[PDB]
Amino acid sequence: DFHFSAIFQPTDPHHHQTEFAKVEGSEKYVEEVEVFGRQALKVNPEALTILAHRAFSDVHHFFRKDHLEGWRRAIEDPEASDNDRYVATTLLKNACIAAGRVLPSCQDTGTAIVLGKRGELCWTGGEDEKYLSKGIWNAYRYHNLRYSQTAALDMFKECNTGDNLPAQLDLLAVPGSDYEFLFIAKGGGSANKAYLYQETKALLNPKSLRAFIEEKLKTLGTAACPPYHIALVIGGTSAEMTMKTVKLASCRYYDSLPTTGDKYGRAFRDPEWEKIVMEVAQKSGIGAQFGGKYFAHQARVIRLPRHGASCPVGLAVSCSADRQILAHINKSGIYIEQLEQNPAQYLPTSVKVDLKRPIDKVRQQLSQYPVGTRVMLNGTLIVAADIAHAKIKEMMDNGEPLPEYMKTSPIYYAGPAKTPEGYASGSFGPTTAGRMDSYVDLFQSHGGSYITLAKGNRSKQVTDACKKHGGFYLGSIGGPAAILAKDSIKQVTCLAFPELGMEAVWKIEVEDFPAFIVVDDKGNDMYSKTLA
Amino acid sequence: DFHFSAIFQPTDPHHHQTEFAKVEGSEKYVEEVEVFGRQALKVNPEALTILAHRAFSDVHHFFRKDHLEGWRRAIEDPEASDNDRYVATTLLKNACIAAGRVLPSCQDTGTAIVLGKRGELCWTGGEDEKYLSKGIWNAYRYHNLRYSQTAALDMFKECNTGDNLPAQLDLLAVPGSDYEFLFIAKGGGSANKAYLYQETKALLNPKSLRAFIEEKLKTLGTAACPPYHIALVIGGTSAEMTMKTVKLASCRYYDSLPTTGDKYGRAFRDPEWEKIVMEVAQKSGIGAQFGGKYFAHQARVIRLPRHGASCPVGLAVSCSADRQILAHINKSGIYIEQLEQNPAQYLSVKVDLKRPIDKVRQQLSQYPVGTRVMLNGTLIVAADIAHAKIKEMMDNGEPLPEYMKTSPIYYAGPAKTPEGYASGSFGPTTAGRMDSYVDLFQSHGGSYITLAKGNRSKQVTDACKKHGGFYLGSIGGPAAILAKDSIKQVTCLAFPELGMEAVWKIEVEDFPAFIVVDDKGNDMYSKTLA
């Protein structure tokens, strides 16, 4: 006989385990009515604007307790490495700055994602996408965030949209008369560490699956600012469903699923395999960015049904800029998840490098030290990320020289958020280094980019380039954009390509800017053992 | 100033370009009403059951014109190879048999996927998932389809659900008072050829993008029964959004998008790059399964906005079992897309298996790869779970079973047998998924001859050379004509609890195949899919 079984059967579908705050007076936006014997809720669509505006403000200044507790664990665990403790302390101090509500926790204020669940009898007037987008627009326009969206005018010609739109608006039709939401401000670096694998039944045994996990976790590297919330989804009804599920799992949205399967194919969380993922992450030695135990805060593993011919697998992370917030609109008004507004309660050796010297003397100083050495940088950085590198390569392909401004100072891969009134800099942490790997040998062959500063492990071509050309790659801590702006970045000026907005080439002056020597001029790489 | 711009701005959002038939009497399930001054629609949820049942019945017996036209093009084009024409003719003849409404076009009757768009003022009572699922359950239970869904009792212990549930039910909240749908019966093999790449700005130039397309298309191989509808999505707001978009593009759901971008980041189809994809597909020589020009029916390329730090890319195909139906419910009733009910308007070495296997191997050794053969005799049928169970038995010290040593191994899983028929639809599954077993099984005295579809990895070529084996490629997709004309007896041999994934013993006549891998290190795909 027919038995309907929903794939997802959370025991807490409305997220009662989360603490919510009411938006004061917001009952004025809703009215209970009855039509054809059924209870319905009229919702003024301005409620959607108000809610999205608050969500995409709050999430940039505060974190959940589970995330903060993870950093505290990395500080207090005797098994944490010294670098684990240093990185987690830096990230907690960054969170304390961000809680001042001026500087966002990361310069990459993300793509705005809305998962909405509109009841059959929740009546908004139907212009939900426009009103949510207006709230998002307000959040990014009137706060010190960043416009991160790139429009395609044609296949290759691009421009920044200038407002962090469009958003990803996934509005679902569900039972009832309420409107439920998950808002995510998703960083690009962690979005890029969402991977889909097309596997088979041959994977589905303990030995094969553990070996697969060990291999795939290393491909995350440190490129998305660990400690990570790691999510792994085994199975699914389509690739897109697997990838949606792994995103939501990384946001802890599926924490209340059953922990056993059944003959109807329901989804389940698998605590045994979560523990295995954590053991693999800890034993990998990758650590909280620079070697140790704290590659991961926690793990979520969701097993899904599959077509017999298929086994899609999703792997994804939430990075240090772990930013999501639940909300709902009901007969009592607008409710939004309460994040931790006092992160300070979770709080309990270097070589000084003067960059205000000829770059060849800086190279000479760095050559004295092994990979893993912590340095403190003082002086000028030239800032250039993806679009600037591509434009400069295009100029060189058309016969122009590498610009002189690429030869005078170390190159910092970064893109700043907007500058608060009275501040020298907005949040201004590093970009993922690996995306620039194809340029390093070329630029060094033309006399520049001998020292680069960014975050994440890099490919072998960069290690080889630095050995051939007497170069270095310095790893900033990834994620602490607010404390870097507040304490280290003293002056920012636009140097080239002003038309590119935040993706222009900048000239910045820094003090006490921490980094580790990741790649030296001798063929060595701090990550060569843990990310072999 | 603020300007809202939806990412997707089709000029034909309601699919007016599609022809629909109304389900007779279905106005009884709907009532137009007015609530607080706006137009609304009451829908009896039984309409959802009726609609899903009809959609997931019709789609297994009929195709769209764009798909059928592609097979005709492959036959009529002087530049098509002989193998292109042979494969396209076989697939058209298969479609003619499926249009008899008894045998489905493919044994893999797919995962049931529903994209639904429920208007704000379309009121069903809210139990939409249950009522849609009942209609799907009805379609798979009361017709000669297949139960393809595998439930996980724990991480590794699995069972077939026995009813082709659960479905993928993606129900969206949209403006208005109607209910619009795309139903997809998605085969596993083409589902597996949905790929996500995480790229960078360094890809976004003509030379790099062309080279990327040329490399990634080859990774599709023939493993999802081409000619393909190829979809490519460049950009997206997340990996899952890129992958949803490439799925929908492959279903021609986004055909009416704009063809230029703007400063607000709207999605667009890119005809220039569609033409480039088609040029790459034709020049690859991969062909309609066995070399030629007809790797692809057509291409869809959608360019999306992206976060400056990100460039997700999706690549996906619709296979020979190209199965989707549009539908809508409105104040007049239930409307369902009309597919082509008259596909007919669009129109070797004999190998006796009734011998010791060593004699069959000796005969096959006389011929080069690319030779077309006709098989007559017993095939032993075993796919993914059966292979895993047999490996496990051997790892625990048990023999390779006798039934892996007597006959060619056909990798397949049958659909249900119609009353009065010898066999349900019964075409091949993708060979590559069994590659990890070939050397092992041959080392232990069996699986010397395998029969399936798709190009295989180098380990299989090496195994067949080391052990004196062969891989035979059936045409991929023509499951109904194979069942009607070639399969004479079917018996479950082992592991009956696995449903369609049991081991079967079948007796066949006139079963066509090509020698893809021989016993000498040669592979029919080595030039085109190196």
Ligand code: SF4
């Ligand atoms: S820089 Fe790091 S913390 Fe910020 S969004 Fe990118 S991956 Fe996340």
Ligand code: SF4
């Ligand atoms: S066997 Fe071929 S035609 Fe049938 S669903 Fe699989 S890929 Fe598609």
